[PDB]
Symmetry: C2
Subunit: 237 residues, 2 copies
């Protein structure tokens, strides 16, 4: 690990504070603007959708990325959530209710063993089985996110290869002639996250970032700041 | 099928001639600017990489999208081809030599049965086993491309689901918050192709286009014209 405090300007430029962590797969070297925050554990919030999805797929709770998860009929504040979804759209719109259902079907016991097998965060699911990642005991650091993602990238997680490929499909966020980004955002009403990786022709750059988000105002900076960092490091144009 | 001659302006705007074929999956309705050219069969050229890849994966010729295909040491005119590649980069750069090797390893017999099982084009592989798609007897129409792609999308082709998912990964071309495009280009030194699909939140639009390409000058119009059509039909913004 190498600390690059210069990356801090990206946060200050935006009257914000946080951490960005990068991992160069080819070189097995990591970078961050704050070695400490890089290791501060936080509630994963939406980013937990990645493991929740893997678990659901492996247990059959989710058949594939096409399967329809019919809306339960309860209108919620976020418009996009009040409709039928599939893994793809459920990830894109961060549809909590769908995932809460997955969690319930998964159940405490299977969830707990699964997170342990994944070596995910503090592996604690205390609280409601269908809300622990949002207001429970589970906590994960950015470096931890990276360790987890690297396993996923390489299909080394303790679930079927198929489940892993499907989740990676569902993580698709951006792609063009220069790179591909597979990631997941999160927001716990205090902290905002963006975790994933940038696929290049001959390398992969894993990333995990989090930042203070007192207001849903700046959710956009999660992606904005990260890219400024990627651009700065010449990972993307 | 519905014929929309208005789409012809897109070709004429560019001093070109060709065909664009669209298929609305949800509605099971197709559209094109020229019902006849839509059915004219042509050499698939690079677009054949899709089936070649599937076959290679299913037979073990290709392990996964990570496996390295070491350059044979013969310098070819196209710069990007003179290096080691993987399925991802091999598709992106349309690396003929890699695919020729796959074909040889696959062999005539297995190739022939595989294309028949796929119901691919005229299913004829006459010519060199490692060049038939470029200067041999195989021919496929745009509507035929679509039929083939629909099977792929739905994992209904006669190969493993895994092989199909991997190829679809390798077809990734573009993605953003509004759509995802999975496709493959082709060029036989007279005809240029772009085939694939546009994934939306609640629908999929398959597409296949081909156009006269006397010169490698206008290869760019394959994607340009198609998008103008997609935009026109309000499929993409
Ligand atoms: Cl993908």
């Amino acid at each position: 690990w190498q600390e690059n405090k210069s990356w801090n300007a990206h946060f200050t430029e935006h009257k914000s504070q946080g951490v960005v962590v990068l991992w160069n797969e080819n070189k097995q070297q990591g970078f961050t603007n704050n070695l400490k925050r890089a290791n501060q554990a936080f509630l994963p919030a939406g980013t937990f959708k990645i493991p929740n999805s893997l678990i659901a797929l492996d247990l059959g709770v989710v058949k594939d990325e096409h399967q329809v998860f019919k809306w339960d009929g309860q209108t919620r504040d976020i418009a996009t959530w009040n409709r039928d979804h599939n893994l793809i759209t459920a990830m894109k719109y961060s549809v909590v209710p769908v995932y809460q259902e997955f969690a319930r079907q998964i159940g405490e016991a299977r969830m707990s063993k699964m997170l342990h097998a994944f070596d995910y965060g503090n592996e604690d699911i205390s609280g409601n089985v269908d809300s622990f990642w949002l207001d429970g005991g589970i906590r994960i650091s950015a470096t931890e996110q990276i360790s987890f993602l690297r396993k996923l990238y390489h299909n080394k997680l303790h679930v079927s290869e198929r489940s892993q490929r499907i989740v990676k499909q569902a993580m698709l966020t951006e792609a063009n002639g220069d790179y591909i980004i597979r990631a997941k955002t999160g927001y716990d009403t205090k902290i905002g996250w963006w975790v994933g990786w940038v696929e290049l022709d001959d390398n992969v750059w894993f990333f995990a970032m989090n930042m203070d988000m007192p207001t849903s105002d700046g959710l956009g900076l999660r992606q904005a700041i990260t890219k400024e960092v990627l651009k700065q490091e010449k990972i993307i144009p």
